[PDB]
C-alpha cells in the first residue's frame, strides 16, 4: 500500500541534519 512513503518521509528529518 501507500505505506511505502513514510519510511523516507521520516528520513528527511535526520538526513537533512546529516547533509
UniProtKB/Swiss-Prot annotation:
Mode of membrane association: Single-pass type I membrane protein
Region described as MPER: 1-19
UniProt-annotated glycosylation sites, renumbered to this chain: 10
Compartments where found: Virion membrane; Host cell membrane; Host endosome membrane
Job of this protein: Acts as a class I viral fusion protein. Under the current model, the protein has at least 3 conformational states: pre-fusion native state, pre-hairpin intermediate state, and post-fusion hairpin state. During fusion of viral and target intracellular membranes, the coiled coil regions (heptad repeats) assume a trimer-of-hairpins structure, positioning the fusion peptide in close proximity to the C-terminal region of the ectodomain. The formation of this structure appears to drive apposition and subsequent fusion of viral and target cell membranes.
Subunit structure: The mature envelope protein (Env) consists of a homotrimer of non-covalently associated gp120-gp41 heterodimers. The resulting complex protrudes from the virus surface as a spike. There seems to be as few as 10 spikes on the average virion.
Name the record gives this protein: Transmembrane protein gp41
Organism expressing this protein natively: Human immunodeficiency virus type 1 group M subtype B (isolate HXB3) (HIV-1)
Organism taxonomic ancestry: Viruses, Riboviria, Pararnavirae, Artverviricota, Revtraviricetes
Gene that encodes the chain: env
